[PDB]
């Protein structure tokens, strides 16, 4: 009965040369019982990508909530929300539930369409923004992801190289966690093309 580790799951984001990558596993379980191997944890609103780990009901709820909020944003602003602005919206929304929080570990990833700059950020369950040049990690195998990323990562990787690095970071981290894995998805994001790849990984 620890809300952040009932369902399991992980998300990781990385920056490269004029690109960003965000990846997640596919598992949804109930403690020991694996229930679904199709549960994707990455969503997008325009060109801004959001990954969410933690309690799956809150993952779903927050996706629906940020779709709601970004849709109204776009109608009033007459433009797509940028990663820096969306990051602030996520922080505000989470801190609004300061003493009754969503049990989640969200991760923002995307490229600012005006400046062309790659942007990633992470949050705790109550809204603290964690900005990084290199990588953000989240989920029940966050320790493992920290260890994988801190050693494997190098700056200014090309999209095709960055794919290999982030995939190997996720896969090997997931295999040391009982609650993570059961499939994986990687998003490679360039200024105006996004490629989504499903990874072959061990299914135990």
């Amino acid at each position: 009965s620890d809300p952040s580790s009932i369902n399991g799951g992980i998300v990781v984001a990385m920056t490269g040369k004029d690109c960003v990558a965000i990846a997640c596993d596919l598992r949804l379980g109930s403690q020991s019982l694996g229930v679904s191997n199709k549960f994707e944890k990455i969503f997008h609103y325009g060109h801004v990508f959001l990954g969410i780990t933690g309690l799956a009901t809150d993952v779903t709820t927050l996706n629906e909530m940020f779709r709601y909020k970004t849709n109204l944003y776009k109608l009033k602003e007459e433009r797509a929300i940028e990663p820096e602005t969306f990051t602030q919206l996520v922080s505000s929304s989470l801190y609004e539930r300061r003493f009754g929080p969503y049990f989640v570990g969200p991760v923002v990833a995307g490229i600012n369409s005006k400046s062309g700059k790659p942007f990633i950020a992470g949050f705790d369950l109550i809204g603290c923004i964690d900005e990084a040049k290199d990588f953000i990690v989240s989920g029940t195998a966050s320790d493992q992801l920290f260890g994988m990323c801190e050693s494997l990562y190098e700056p200014n990787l090309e999209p095709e190289d960055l794919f290999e690095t982030i995939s190997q970071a996720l896969l090997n981290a997931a295999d040391r966690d009982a609650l993570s894995g059961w499939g994986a998805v990687v998003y490679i994001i360039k200024k105006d093309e996004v490629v989504k790849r499903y990874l072959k990984m061990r299914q135990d």
Binding site: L28, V35, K38, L55, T57, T60
Partner: protein, 195 residues
Amino acid sequence: MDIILGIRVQDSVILASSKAVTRGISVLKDSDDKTRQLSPHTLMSFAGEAGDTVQFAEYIQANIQLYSIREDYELSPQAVSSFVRQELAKSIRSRRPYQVNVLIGGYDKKKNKPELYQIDYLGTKVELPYGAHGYSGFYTFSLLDHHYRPDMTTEEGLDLLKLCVQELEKRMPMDFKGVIVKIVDKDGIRQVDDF
């Protein structure tokens, strides 16, 4: 309460739900129907806390029926499942949360496809080829992982379901007094009387 199962095959969704209602050291009833018809092509089974289960089921039933009358239209299984999820997701942070787990089996008439949704009391929704709530999953999931194929007929699905009930009747500690089986397809909802 206790055992609720669901299998989605080629053309239908089949729900099996245990018939026992046990309180203390007494089985009070052995013919309990743990299901409600939400709309002509949508059926919901439920298990969990006593009282909470039927109260929630009938509350959802009333709302979907209200919608049907207002719009002269049947909500899609996906739409109904999302409504139900949100109600449970609200509930979990209430003063007293509904402790009810549900399966929603529906036939989308616009898509001509069967659909099965598993939603727990927290509001955790997943679409599945086969689903279970409670301890049932610990036996049936692995069994179905082995024997299930996505192109099975309703008859093949029923045989696959017989295999699950047999396993549960062999290895489960409690006597759940068999199951009531219901099929959801293009022609609506019907009950198999001889199971």
